[PDB]
Design a protein around this ligand. Structure first.
Ligand SMILES: *[C@](O)(C(N)=O)[C@H](CC1CCC1)NC(=O)[C@@H]1[C@@H]2[C@H](CN1C(=O)[C@@H](NC(=O)NC(C)(C)C)C(C)(C)C)C2(C)C
Ligand SMILES: *[C@](O)(C(N)=O)[C@H](CC1CCC1)NC(=O)[C@@H]1[C@@H]2[C@H](CN1C(=O)[C@@H](NC(=O)NC(C)(C)C)C(C)(C)C)C2(C)C
Lengths: 304, 304
């Protein structure tokens, strides 16, 4: 029993983290086969970051300007390109610890593990959700850039996030491993707005199922509701509208609890309308939306 | 910026996890040098667990009754003993992936990372606190027994916890790596009470410092207080009494925020007396006590 925010075990990603240095900027790189991936703003001075022309800045740089270090071992750069907002540094040495891997662009509301790194050394691992507004609420200090988000499928690491920048709330924006930002952000230090951020309704339901499975049932009331009716309560409380895809995704949890999704929506409506009256659900005094149905099924039926 | 419950990177511990099988019971073992450590109740049938005589039960067992598997590799057992509530299985093969390690007994209020494992395969990693009543609030399904808690100091893994049992709230009890339970618990399926559990006051203060460092300051009020005066508010709210050791431990955070500990206590008193009035601190609608000052300094000044 018990329900915690759990990250994937990070070992397979630890073996891929390197330090990348150009001028005095140091950040983290991801070393897979004979290619090191990092944020392209590694080539910028503090001044450059205000309005950088990355093509012109990159042109001043040659292979030998890029100090790539794996532990206490210097890799030799034999090629450099920019793909969108990532630098790819081609090295002579394939990473002998390269796991089976893929690059995936994750969808809003999906979760991933972050291996927060400094100077190419892993400090810590935690679980994050891609918010509907394509930010994450991470823990990222100066040095953390190029730290990566991932999922593990069997023995296969799916890399989905590289850390680039912090936005004015203490929220985080970054790219996929092809260097495409999640959201409207650009890698320039100028005014930029994250959208209004909605609650991942299907995640909150999954978490209420998690609460039921773990014996927290108090919020389970006498009522039911309709897709139309709940989705009207959702709109008012800045929750994302629930679809039949969502109802279908909740099937395994529904079937494990013998609680119809629409009953669970009725409980949710009453929590949104009445609040929680000083009580807790899985030790939280708030509705939690950073667990996918997948994460709940994984944790509550224990897959490796 | 940002503040999250972060676990140590788990790679060094992943390489130590094995599967241990006796009769039809399977759980996790920790393989260090030529010794595999697991919970001794691996030798029990469901019936045995009610009132086991571990000495007599162990006597029915020989080296060959113990199926130790590292991935798809069977280790050969050349010795077995019981130390307190752990079995030590001596194997022919030293773990080639043995990290630099120590066994430590942690104190109440200290944190550690759990690598939750099933059939000797790591599923996930999360951060836990040894509660004042020597339980933990983990995520542990059938199969999780022998999963371990640890800290990483430099390159040195300090193992501090092995998972043994679940108590009636969905709370967890286990041993150090010498097989001594934390708390009054025994490895028998019979009525057992965890003490009343107090709040780790020094941890809550560390977390309020974390909140200030990250710009959440609203709870910072005009008042101050005394050690005696706050500790009287603490007693009433089931908080552990704050000592000068605690004030001294909060020094680095005090000095980083230029906020006197006793002012921060005054804010805490008002939160305990008035509650939070529907507001949040670092995205929590509750006072968080599972971060040590150490964890706050680590995260908020980024050590690897
Ligand atoms: C990483 O590059 C790193 N070296 O680790 C770094 C992390 C942050 C945490 C403080 C430094 N990211 C940046 O430096 C990033 C690079 C410049 C400016 N960056 C920012 O993150 C800035 N954010 C920002 O200007 N946000 C908007 C665009 C105004 C909303 C900081 C003000 C936090 C430095 C670029 C290219 C975006
Ligand atoms: C591990 O052994 C394992 N195989 O992974 C297991 C984990 C729990 C989660 C369901 C099984 N632990 C036990 O089986 C443990 C072994 C027996 C009974 N155990 C319990 O955890 C029981 N708790 C319990 O009886 N608690 C008290 C003592 C009544 C407060 C369960 C009821 C949860 C099975 C022993 C030796 C304690």
């Amino acid at each position: 029993s018990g329900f915690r925010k759990m990250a994937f075990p990070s070992g397979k990603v630890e073996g891929c983290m390197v330090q990348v240095t150009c001028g005095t900027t140091t950040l983290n790189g991801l070393w897979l086969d004979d290619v090191v991936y990092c944020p392209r703003h590694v080539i910028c001075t503090s001044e450059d970051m205000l309005n950088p022309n990355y093509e012109d800045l990159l042109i001043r740089k040659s292979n030998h300007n890029f100090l790539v270090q794996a532990g206490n071992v210097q890799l030799r750069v034999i090629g450099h390109s920019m793909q969108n907002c990532v630098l790819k540094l081609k090295v002579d040495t394939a990473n002998p610890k390269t796991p089976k891997y893929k690059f995936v662009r994750i969808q809003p509301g999906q979760t991933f593990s972050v291996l927060a790194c400094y100077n190419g050394s892993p400090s810590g691992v935690y679980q994050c959700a891609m918010r509907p507004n394509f930010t994450i609420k991470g823990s990222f200090l100066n040095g953390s850039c190029g730290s990566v988000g991932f999922n593990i499928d069997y023995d296969c690491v799916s890399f989905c996030y590289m850390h680039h920048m912090e936005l004015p709330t203490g929220v985080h924006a970054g790219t996929d491993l092809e260097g495409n930002f999640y959201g409207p952000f650009v890698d320039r230090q100028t005014a930029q707005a994250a959208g209004t951020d909605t609650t991942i309704t299907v995640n909150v339901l999954a978490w209420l199922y998690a609460a039921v499975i773990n014996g927290d049932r108090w919020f389970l009331n006498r009522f039911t509701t309709t897709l139309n009716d709940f989705n009207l309560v959702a709109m008012k409380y800045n929750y994302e509208p629930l679809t039949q895809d969502h109802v279908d995704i909740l099937g395994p949890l529904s079937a494990q609890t013998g609680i119809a999704v629409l009953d669970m929506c009725a409980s949710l409506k009453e929590l949104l309308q009445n609040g929680m009256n000083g009580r807790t659900i899985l030790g939280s005094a708030l509705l939690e939306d950073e667990f996918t149905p997948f994460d709940v099924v994984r944790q509550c039926s224990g897959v490796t």
